């Protein structure tokens, strides 16, 4: 009932997915072999949303894993937790895009996109009632940004009356993993804005602050870093997977948090985050969860709200815990931080409560907030892009694969246009 | 013999109905599975009797999302309900009145109407409808509008009572709450005989102060609202020294075609340890019920004037002391009635004392009072909601969603002007006028 | 005493008859082997008693292919049937009307007639014939049309009732149904007293929706068919307060020699777990049977008029509420009779409650309603089917298989205009006329 | 009861039969020696249709294996499964036809055809009630194509009121096994059209793709290649060999699928196909069978139905399975694919259901659809033939053994006429 399809593109998508489906397996009590070994029957009431029943109590997931190079699939296939995927889903190419937009959207993406479009259509008909699409990709590389944008356009035209969520990874401001970051970003965003519904802008080095400071980890590896991304990934969509006193769903969030079609760039956040040694000295209660959530320190995007305002906010609590203090504390946050909210949107808070606590924790909360602070996130990217394109650098081979100089004209003329309304609304009266 | 049917819409409706039907089962001495170990008719008003000794409710549970209905199916009340009535769609309206009223709402309305017609033709002396629905919920508001229109079209002149869930002024859980409220109120202003209001923040204040509970989950609030529902219905369900009916309620509360928005109150609401140190006399419970800190809508009647009042006493009661308490409250200064209503009181008495649920927050009582007041203190709530809606709509937020889901601008404009006129008329009637 | 024989032809008839005769032994308490553990005749109209304690049926199983009859011999109902009657050929007709009517029909038609005169002389008060034949197939359409010519001449004026299997509009097992149907109807239009129509796609909806079964195999579907079959002859085999014979419906439901195409319907049809929560009263099963979602042919009666009706109750039924429930149906406006039929109902009652076969989908029930309404809604069934055949004959598809097997092109034209004549007369009589 | 006669001509017919009768042996549970070793008596109720009961509970096939060269019989006789055939049936010549039409029709076929007709007549009288003939030949070789039509004419004249089916192997478009492909094909088909009730046009390389894509077998040998042909062969005739809820017979298929005498060229199809490794992750459920059956790529003929329309479509299900879903599914297939069906034949579907599953599978289905896409198959052969015949290439070797120039005139004047009628029906109104 209300199934959603998981799509993974780029190297991050499989790396995030390899740990994402680890989390879902533990929640539903699924052994690595793929056989149910759980005890509670509440988890099996709604199991079709993510997994699919198969012959002899098999539970293969509804996952599509696609990459341009075989260097990522061999890891998940040969490694553990690869025995439950269906090998038909393991779509792979021959060579990577090489961090090229054209080599991920025009030249080689034409023949690969036709193969995946078959499997997703095959998966869609197998579904009972499709609810939406859940996509994971990177905005910095070529395969994740290039084809993933192309796949969205093809999915959008075939399924116009359906919702989709993109858990994109915004390029890090302070550190640049790839030399050519701005060129990939602006080309993807210019095509993403008009053909998507709701995106979660997370950051790479912003995650580094939390694990090093809040979790007090000295060597944060990608295994631990991706684990935090999974927690805020399994919490947003846990409302329809489990019962609750005030339920939510994928469409419910999109109605409350998208005032305008263009303004659909979000900011996630997770709480609580306590280390193994320092968790004995903190009373896990409802009060501190909201306080530990709204502060600029525990935020998953490299943005300071102190320079901006919160347009809308949605908090998805979990675990067995009463609701009276949820609103009385939300009112206190609304009153104490009253200078940090938009005036022409009253009571701009949405709340929802689940029933099943996360593994090894009594209660937790997930915060997603549409804020104006993203305005400076795009300006920094736009400032970097407009400097390099003026020198006409690195584009001597971009034109070699079909794309042309005039393509830059519209991409840049909209990012400054998008940020114009993204900012003029903040001071609008 | 006089049959009333209950329609529960939305998750709030389903949970409130679960609590209410639990309370009915304890009241009529029926086990959850349908068997049983003044009394017997009473249950024939609600519990239709089947071939065997089982009794089945006259409830119509309807929802779009299937999760809450799955929960109520899996609950301990799985045998009692007739499995056909539990009507579920596939996806919820997601706090979109447009979705809940136009797009998906028309694909299940036929089935719910068919079941309503089947149940209404099954009974003999049908009395009316009790609709348990919320206001913030998109499915709740959309199905409220659609079902009001359809039932008014089908059955001409019957009682249509609603137990709404008013949006709280400070407590808030939605963002499209003003839009849902304005649209549903404009649509169902002309298609309801008498609509009660209940607010969650007020119930939370009541449970915090009067009952002194620090962990007030939704169960306690649902228990309270179910207690008010049972108290208002005990007049039909039981015999008393002075009976009262739903038509009596309407004709004694609502004086005008539009001014039909009363508010409910219950008494006594005291804890378990405080029960031993209290007397529970008729006069003191009457004063407690009229106390402004016990009303279940976050509006203090001191800012307005009472216009009509109905009180149902149940248990051991003497009409003389009832009369004395009513007279002294009438002569009290702070309570102020309207000039053109020299008699603003309607009293009913019932011989059945209320019964407390096992494990409940309340304590056993021998006397109970339910109060229903049509006043002008709801005008401030209407004005506040209208101001919030106008402020939100001044720059066209979420209008793209609403218009894309089959709407226009005339609907918003006419709802705004309609509630402006309604508030103006409410204030003009409530305020004293020369001659 | 008054005897009727049943002719089962084709795998449709044999499979239906396998469960059809399954029910009679249950009704009359007959063990599959013929032994025994109202009563005492009951079985003398169907079960011709032999010298020993065994009772043998009065059925004539006939088919062209030896496949479907084989499992009947090797099934659990092996000893009951008399081994002579199971007439089998060597090869089927391959959905070819020509093969089953001209080439291979004649070489075996003389063997079935021999067993008919053998069994007709064995009985004393022979009443009529029961035919269980489909339309799409070859041995079920061409071969049975040969019988209608052979039985008619041998026995001038007796009852000839057919329980056909109407081809479905959307559902289509075969590819030459428009060729078999029109050829069958034209020849057997004038040699049938009344032909009860049954569609295959309609029973899926009844089983899926009313009974809520997700796996409706032919075993469960054919079970729902034998109930009407055991219902039409439920008054011959049992004593009732108001009895009906096979000439009653034949006289009450045939206003004109051509318009003799009624359609069956059964009630109540409810599940096992839903049985405990249903009152199951005479007042509702009259309404439950009449609803357009319960008929066993995919033709909604709302599009047309009810030419006539016929009801056969049973069990603990009192003739007052039957009078009451039937009377209020004329007031309700989902029914629409013709002007020249002011009285248009027939009622029959019986004292034997229906019995459910163990392992079946139905639950034990104390009442039963089986409506047989001749109505104008079947006019659309011929016109819609006539459109399909008229499209085939435009370019003479599949014709070469028919012409070379012993029929002429001219014979096809006559069957085409005959359905136009029937459709014109049936609509013209059904529609109002001046003066 | 309604016995069937199996005729095998050419090397392919012997090789196909060498594995075909393996499939029949497993279904009816006979040992390689020839003695029944089964468990269920449901198999022996109809055993005379294919096998023949002999003294001391021994069964022998009702098949004749004939070729112009002794190499093929030497393999089957010396190898296993040669001890159950009656040695009389093993007819062999002295030398192969050498891929020559005349040598397989006039010179070396005249003396052999008299010997085989004796065994045909002898076997027919041993039969109780003859139902038809099954013939397996090749349209590219000499002996299979040359004599095969010669035996058809001899059988046709002496049994006129009888049906027969030919499982012809159409030459591959992409690869030509023999240099002179077109000359054999156009001469045989012109003689095939006049006196053949129904033919199954299968291809060789079109089956190469099926094994390579689904079975993911890197090296498809003829041992495994012919196995899928046998399953299609066994699925057609299992209806009268086993009980069914809705039976079909060889006479039912012909009348349902032959609107006109000249239009009896078919396209087979089998489903499901799943490799051993990937069969655990697929739930064998009736909805997936029909969808896997109708897709253009999973076809046993090298002709995509996208460029054509389905005249009529058959489906022969197998195994225990409910009847409702197959009934309603083909409506959904008809509704979704409504643009690919002939307008003047509505409800153009024949459905049949058996009651015994295939070995090692819960259920299966077989598709036989008379499509217009055959039109493109004959046009290529006609185009290839008319190009070579203009140059008179290889002609001087054919005319030296009986044939002559104007013999080719009618064969070509029939193909373009047949393909014209085959074409002027899809566009006809
Ligand atoms: N959150 C997270 N991000 C990662 C991780 N590994 C890589 N990334 C991000 O992914 C980006 C890599 O680019 P990709 O889109 O994967 O490109 P690719 O898969 O190497 O293919 P090419 O574009 O052709 O080079 C880097 O810029 C990182 O920011 C990871 O483990 N966790
Ligand atoms: N009194 C009371 N109110 C409740 C309860 N649960 C939810 N509500 C109210 O119901 C509102 C939510 O709207 P719902 O009708 O439940 O919406 P839904 O059921 O999720 O369906 P959609 O409107 O389509 O999203 C909240 O604003 C609450 O005020 C409850 O247990 N008791
Ligand atoms: N109600 C019902 N109908 C059936 C059943 N089995 C087959 N049919 C119908 O019978 C039709 C097939 O035509 P038949 O007359 O049965 O064909 P046949 O009896 O095998 O004789 P031939 O046409 O010569 O093959 C199908 O279209 C089905 O609708 C059954 O078990 N129940
Ligand atoms: N499907 C299938 N086809 C085969 C197989 N082996 C050979 N063939 C086909 O058979 C054809 C060979 O022609 P044949 O009719 O067998 O000729 P022959 O038996 O060698 O005798 P000559 O014609 O005199 O050479 C080739 O073109 C192949 O297409 C096989 O194992 N499977
Ligand atoms: Mg890469
Ligand atoms: Mg909801
Ligand atoms: Mg047959
Ligand atoms: Mg050879």
Considering only CB atoms, C397 lies closest to which of D1, D259, D347, namely D259
Cβ contacts (< 8 Å) between C212 and chain B: which residues? none
Q: Which residues of D touch C95 (CB under 8 A)?
A: 252, 255-256
End-to-end CA distance of chain C: 47
Cβ–Cβ < 8 Å for B336, B305: yes
Residue C287 to residue B56, Cβ atoms within 8 A: no
Report whether residue D140 contacts ligand 4, using a CB cutoff of 6 Å: yes
Buried b (16+ CB within 10 A) or exposed e, A258-283: bbbeebbbbbbbbbbbbeeeeeeeee
Residues 6+ apart with CB under 8 A from A103: A97, A109, A142, A146, A401
CATH number of the domain enclosing A298: 3.30.1330.20
For residue A115, give how far its alpha carbon lies from the nearest alpha carbon of chain D (Å).
13
Q: Are residues A363 and A379 in the same domain?
A: no
What separation in Å is there between the alpha carbon of A67 and the centre of ligand 5? Answer: 7
Q: Is C70 on the interface with D (CB under 8 A)?
A: yes
Indicate the number of domains in chain A.
3
Does one domain contain both D278 and D341? yes
Cα(D317)–Cα(D271) distance, integer angstroms: 10
Angle at A132 between CA A129 and CA A137, to 5 degrees: 145
Are C178 and C136 spatial neighbours (Cβ–Cβ below 8 Å)? no
A385 half-sphere exposure, CB direction, 13 A CA radius? 22
d(CA A337, CA A347): 13
Ligand 3 site, residue C222, Cβ cutoff 6 A: yes
Q: Give the strand pairing for D310-317 and D365-371.
A: antiparallel
Closest CA to C261 of C164, C355, C386, C168: C164
Mark which of A219, A236, A257 sits at the end of a domain. A257
Distance from the Cα of A127 to chain B's closest Cα (Å) equals 13
Q: Reduced to 3 states, what is the DSSP secondary structure of residue B242?
A: strand
Distance (Å) of CA C150 to CA C103, C112, C192, D393: 16, 10, 13, 67
**Distance, CA of D34 to CA of B352 (rounded, Å):** 89
Query: The tokens of A152 are what?
Result: 């969205």
Residue of C97, C165, C168, C174 to mutate for D, most D C-beta atoms under 10 A: C174
Compute the distance between CA of residue D34 and CA of residue D49 in angstroms, rounded to an integer.
Answer: 16
Ligand 2 pocket list (CB less than 6 A): A 246-247, 252; B 10-12, 15, 64-65, 92-95, 134, 136-140, 165, 173-174, 200, 218, 221-222
Residue A140: give its domain's CATH number.
3.40.50.1440
Burial of residue D382, with CB atoms counted within 10 A of its CB: 0-12 exposed, 13-18 middle, 19 or more buried: buried
Residues 6+ apart with CB under 8 A from D212: D218, D220
User: Do chains A and C meet with 3 or more Cβ pairs nearer than 8 Å?
Assistant: no
Distance from CA of D89 to the nearest CA of C (A): 28
Chain A residues within 8 A of B74 when measuring between CB atoms: 45
Cα–Cα distance measured from residue C206 to residue B371, given in angstroms and rounded to the nearest whole number: 50
Measured CA to CA, the distance from residue D151 to residue A201 in angstroms comes to 76
Max CA-CA distance within chain C? 65
Both D231 and D281 in one domain: the answer is no
Residues D277 and D383 in one domain: no
Tell me the chain B residues in contact with residue C287 when contact means C-beta distances shorter than 8 Å: 121
* D contacts of A54 (beta carbons < 8 Å): 280-283
Residues in chain A with CB shorter than 8 Å from the CB of D274 are: none
The reply to whether A404 and A272 lie within a common domain is no
* D142 in a known ligand binding site: yes
| Residues forming a β-bridge with A368 | A314
> Rounded distance, CA C301 to CA C317, Å?
27
Residues D209 and D339 in one domain: no
Q: What single DSSP character describes residue B199?
A: B
Distance CA C408, CA C41 (A): 50
Asked if residues B73 and B48 have their Cβ atoms less than 8 Å apart, the reply is no
The CA–CA distances, whole Å, from A317 to A236, A320, A353, C121, C264 equal 10, 10, 5, 85, 58
- Print the domain residue range for A386: 375-427
Of A391, A395, A393, the C-alpha closest to A403 is A395
C415 CA to centre of ligand 3 in angstroms: 23
- R_g over Cα of chain D: 21
The rounded distance, in Å, linking the Cα atoms of B94 and A198 is 15
Residue identified by tokens 């996806």 is: B91
SS3 content of chain D, % helix, strand, coil (to 5): 45, 15, 40
Q: Contact at 8 Å (CB) between A49 and A26?
A: no
Q: Closest approach of chain D CAs to the CA of A16, in angstroms?
A: 23
Closest residue in chain D to residue A118, using alpha carbons only: D295
Longest dimension (CA), chain B: 65
Cβ of A129 and B91 within 8 Å? yes
Using CB atoms, which residue from C273, C279, C287 is nearest to B50? C279
Bridge partners of residue C385, in order along the sequence: none
How many angstroms separate the CA atoms of A394 and A187, rounded? 14
For residue D129, the 8-state DSSP code is S
Q: Measure Cα distances from C139 to B205, B267, C99, D129, D245 in Å.
A: 81, 80, 8, 19, 16
C403 touches chain D (CB under 8 A): no
CA of D170 to the centre of ligand 4 (A): 11
How far apart are the C-alpha atoms of C83 and A308, rounded to whole Å? Answer: 94
Residue D395: give its domain's CATH number.
Answer: 1.10.287.600
If phi > 0 it is left, if psi is from -120 to 50 it is alpha, else beta; for residue D263 that is beta
**CA angle D37–D43–D44, rounded 5-degree value:** 80
Distance separating alpha carbons of residues C427 and C377, to the nearest angstrom: 10
| Encoded tokens for D262 | 């000249």
What's the rounded Cα separation, in Å, for the pair D384 and D163? 32
Whether residues B216 and A259 touch (CB distance < 8 A) is answered with no
Atom of ligand 3 nearest to the CA of C11: 19
- Please, do chains D and A touch (3+ CB pairs < 8 Å)? yes
Helix (H) or strand (E) holding A329: helix A324-336
Query: In this structure, how many other beta carbons lie within 10 angstroms of the beta carbon of residue A216?
Result: 12
Contact C17, C140 (CB under 8 A): no
Residues tagged in the binding site annotation of A for GDP? 10-12, 15, 99, 138, 142-144, 177, 204, 222, 226
Task: Please answer whether residues D422 and D375 qualify as being in contact, where contact means their C-beta atoms are separated by less than 8 angstroms.
Answer: yes
* Count of C-beta atoms within a 10 Å radius of residue D48: 18
- The residue contributing the CA closest to ligand 3 atom 6 is C12
Residues A380 and A369 in one domain: no
The reply to whether D89 and D214 lie within a common domain is yes
Question: Chains B, A in contact: 3+ Cβ pairs under 8 A?
Answer: yes
Q: Inter-chain contact D278–A53, Cβ cutoff 8 Å?
A: no
- Report how many Cβ contacts below 8 Å link chain C to chain D: 95
- Please tell me what DSSP assigns to residue D172: P
Helix axes C319-331, C282-290, angle to 10 degrees: 40
**Which among B66, B95, B178 has the least Cβ separation from residue A255?**
B95
Structural element, H or E, at residue D9? strand D3-9
Which chains have 3+ CB pairs within 8 A of C? B, D
Q: What is the largest CA-CA distance in chain D?
A: 63
Rounded CA-CA distance A334/A60 in Å is: 44
SS3 A404: coil
Instruction: Determine how β-strand A130-136 pairs with β-strand A3-8.
Output: parallel
For residue B415, give the nearest of B142, B136, B197, B185 by alpha carbon. B185
Whether B33 and chain C come into contact, CB under 8 Å, resolves to no
Residue position matching structure tokens 């022969």: D316
The secondary element (H helix, E strand) that includes residue D226 is helix D222-236
Nearest-CA residue for atom 5 of ligand 4? D12
End-to-end C-alpha distance for chain A, whole angstroms: 43
Q: Give dist(CA D172, CA D377) in Å, integer.
A: 10
State both tokens at A49.
């949303």
Q: Nearest-CA residue of chain B relative to C284?
A: B122
Q: DSSP 3-state assignment of D314?
A: strand
Same domain, residue pair D353 and D336: yes
Residue in chain A lying closest to B136 (CA): A350
Order of strands across the sheet that contains C87-88? C87-88, C59-63, C4-9, C128-132, C159-163, C194-196
D99 lines ligand 4 (CB under 6 A): yes
Same domain, A237 and A287: no
D275 and D391 in a single domain? The answer is: no
Helices (H) then strands (E): counts for chain B: 14, 12
Contact assessment for residue B314 and residue B350, using Cβ atoms and an 8 Å cutoff? yes
Shortest-distance Cα residue to atom 17 of ligand 3: C137
Around B322, how many Cα atoms within 13 Å sit in the side-chain half-sphere? 21
Three-state secondary structure call for residue B189: coil
Domain boundary among A233, A257, A281: A257
Q: Is the distance from CB of D97 to CB of D150 less than 8 angstroms?
A: no
User: CA-nearest residue of chain B to C283?
Assistant: B122
Cβ contact B174:B139 at 8 Å: no
Tell which of A195, A224, A257 closes a domain: A257
Residue D97 to residue D149: CA distance in whole angstroms: 14
Q: Which of C15, C137, C162 to mutate to test the pocket of ligand 3 (most atoms within 8 A of CB)?
A: C137
- The minimal CB distance from B397 to the residues A1, A45, A259 is found for A259
Of D27, D43, D3, nearest in space to D243 by CA? D43
Q: CB A75: neighbour CB atoms within 10 A? A: 13
Residues of the binding site of A for GTP: 11, 69, 138, 142-144, 204, 226
A1 contacts in chain B (CB < 8 Å): 66, 90
Nearest to B216 among A245, A324, A428 (CB): A324
The burial of D174, by beta-carbon neighbours within 10 Å (0-12 exposed, 13-18 middle, 19 or more buried), is given as: exposed
A114 CA → ligand 1 middle, Å? 23
Contact D182, D381 (CB under 8 A): yes
Same domain? For A243 and A301 the reply is no
Inter-chain contact C276–B121, Cβ cutoff 8 Å? no
Residue B242: beta bridge partners?
Answer: B349
- Can you give chain C as a three-state secondary structure string? CCCEEEEEEHHHHHHHHHHHHHHHHHHCCCCCCCCCCCCCCCHHHCCEECCCCCEECCEEEEECCCCHHHHHHHCCCCCCCCCCCCEECCCCCCCCCCHHHHHCCHHHHHHHHHHHHHHHHHCCCCCEEEEECCCCCCCCCHHHHHHHHHHHHHCCCCEEEEECCECCCCCCCCCCHHHHHHHHHHHHCCCCCEEEECEHHHHHHHHHHHCCCCCCCHHHHHHHHHHHHHHHCCCCCCCCCECCCHHHHHHHCCCCCCCCCCECECECCCCCCCCCCCCCCHHHHHHHHHCCCCECCCCCHHHCCECCCCEECCECCCHHHHHHHHHHHHHCCCCCECCCCCCCCCEEECCCCCCCCCCCCCCCCCECECCCECEHHHHHHHHHHHHHHHHHCCCCCCHHHHHCCCCCHHHHHHHHHHHHHHHHHHHHHHCCCCC
Name the residue with tokens 């204040």.
B205
For this experimental structure, what is the resolution in angstroms?
4.3
Sheet bearing A365-371, strands edge to edge: A270-271, A365-371, A310-317, A349-353
How far apart CA C321 and CA B210 sit, in angstroms, is 56
Among partner residues D278, D283, D291, which is closest to A87 by beta-carbon distance?
D278
Q: Name the DSSP letter for residue A339.
A: G
B361 close to B220: Cβ distance less than 8 angstroms: yes
Q: Which of D277, D281, D288 sits opposite A58 (nearest CB)?
A: D281
CA C276, CA C364: separation in Å to the nearest integer?
Answer: 11
- Six-digit token string for D403: 């044939």
Chain B, nearest residue to A249 by Cα? B94
């Amino acid at each position: 009932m209300r199934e959603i399809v998981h799509i993974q593109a780029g190297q991050c998508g499989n790396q995030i997915g390899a740990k994402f489906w680890e989390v879902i397996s533990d929640e539903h009590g699924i052994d690595p072999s793929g056989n149910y070994v759980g005890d509670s029957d509440l988890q099996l009431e709604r199991i079709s949303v993510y997994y699919n029943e198969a012959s002899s109590h098999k539970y293969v997931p509804r996952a599509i894993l696609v990459d341009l190079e075989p260097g990522t699939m061999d890891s998940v296939r040969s490694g553990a937790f690869g025995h439950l995927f269906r090998p038909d889903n393991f779509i792979f190419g021959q060579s990577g895009a090489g961090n090229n937009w054209a080599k991920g959207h025009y030249t080689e993406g034409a023949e690969l996109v036709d193969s995946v479009l078959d499997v997703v259509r095959k998966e869609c008909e197998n579904c009972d009632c499709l609810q939406g699409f859940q996509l994971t990709h990177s905005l910095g590389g070529g395969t994740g940004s290039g084809m993933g944008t192309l796949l969205i356009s093809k999915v959008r035209e075939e399924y116009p009356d359906r919702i989709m969520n993109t858990f994109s990874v915004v390029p890090s401001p302070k550190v640049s993993d790839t030399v050519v970051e701005p060129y990939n970003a602006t080309l993807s965003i210019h095509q993403l804005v008009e053909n998507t519904d709701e995106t979660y802008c997370i950051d790479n080095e912003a995650l580094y602050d939390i694990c090093f400071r809040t979790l007090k980890l000295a060597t944060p590896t990608y295994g631990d870093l991706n684990h935090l991304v999974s927690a805020t990934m399994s919490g947003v969509t846990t409302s329809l997977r489990f019962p609750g006193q005030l339920n939510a769903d994928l469409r419910k969030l999109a109605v409350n948090m998208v005032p305008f079609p263009r303004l659909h760039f979000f900011m996630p956040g997770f709480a609580p985050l306590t280390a193994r040694g320092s968790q004995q000295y903190r009373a896990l209660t409802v009060p501190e969860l909201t306080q530990q959530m709204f502060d600029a320190k525990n935020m998953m995007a490299a943005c300071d709200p102190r320079h901006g305002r919160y347009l809308t906010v949605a908090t998805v609590f979990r675990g067995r815990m009463s609701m009276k203090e949820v609103d009385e504390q939300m009112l206190a946050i609304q009153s104490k931080n009253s200078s940090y909210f938009v005036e022409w949107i009253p009571n701009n808070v949405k709340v929802a409560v689940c029933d099943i606590p996360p593994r090894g924790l009594k209660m937790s909360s997930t915060f997603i907030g549409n804020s104006t602070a993203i305005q400076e996130l795009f300006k920094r990217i736009s400032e970097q892009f407009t400097a390099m394109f003026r020198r006409k650098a690195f584009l001597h081979w971009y034109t070699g694969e079909g794309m042309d100089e005039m393509e830059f004209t519209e991409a840049e003329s909209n990012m400054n246009d998008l940020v114009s309304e993204y900012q003029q609304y903040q001071d609008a009266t | 013999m006089r049959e009333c049917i209950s329609i529960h819409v939305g998750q709030a409706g389903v949970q409130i109905g679960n609590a209410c039907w639990e309370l009915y089962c304890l009241e009529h001495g029926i086990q959850p599975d349908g068997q049983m170990p003044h009394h017997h008719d009473s249950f024939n008003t609600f519990f239709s009797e089947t071939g065997a000794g089982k009794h089945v409710p006259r409830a119509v549970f309807v929802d779009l999302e299937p999760t809450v209905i799955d929960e109520v199916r899996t609950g301990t009340y799985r045998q009692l309900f007739h499995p056909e009535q539990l009507i579920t769609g596939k996806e919820d309206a997601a706090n979109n009145y447009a979705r809940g009223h136009y797009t998906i709402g028309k694909e299940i309305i036929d089935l719910v109407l068919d079941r309503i017609r089947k149940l209404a033709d099954q009974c003999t002396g049908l009395q009316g409808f009790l609709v348990f629905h919320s206001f913030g919920g998109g499915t709740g508001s959309g199905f409220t509008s659609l079902l009001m229109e359809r039932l008014s079209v089908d059955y001409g002149k019957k009682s249509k009572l609603e137990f709404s869930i008013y949006p709280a002024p400070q407590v808030s859980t939605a963002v499209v709450e003003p839009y849902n409220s304005i649209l549903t109120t404009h649509t169902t202003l002309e298609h309801s005989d008498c609509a009660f209001m209940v607010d969650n923040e007020a119930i939370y204040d009541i449970c915090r102060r009067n009952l002194d509970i620090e962990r007030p989950t939704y169960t306690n609030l649902n228990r309270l609202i179910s207690q008010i529902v049972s108290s208002i219905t005990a007049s039909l369900r039981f015999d008393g020294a002075l009976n009262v009916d739903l038509t009596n309620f309407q004709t004694n509360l609502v004086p005008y075609p539009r001014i039909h928005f009363p508010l409910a109150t219950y008494a006594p609401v005291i804890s378990a340890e405080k029960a031993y140190h209290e007397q529970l006399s008729v006069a003191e419970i009457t004063n407690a019920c009229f106390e402004p800190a016990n009303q279940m809508v976050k509006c203090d009647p001191r800012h307005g004037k009472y216009m009509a009042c109905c009180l149902l006493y149940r248990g051991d009661v003497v009409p003389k002391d009832v009369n004395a308490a009513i007279a002294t409250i009438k002569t009290k200064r702070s309570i102020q009635f309207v000039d053109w209503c020299p008699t603003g009181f309607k009293v009913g008495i019932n011989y059945q004392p209320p019964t407390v649920v096992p494990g409940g927050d309340l304590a056993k009582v021998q006397r109970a009072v339910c109060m229903l007041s049509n006043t002008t203190a709801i005008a401030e709530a209407w004005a506040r909601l209208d101001h919030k809606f106008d402020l939100m709509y001044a720059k066209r937020a979420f209008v793209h969603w609403y218009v894309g889901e089959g709407m226009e601008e005339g609907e918003f404009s006419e709802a705004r002007e309609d509630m402006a006129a309604l508030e103006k008329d409410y204030e003009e009637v409530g305020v004293d006028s020369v001659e």
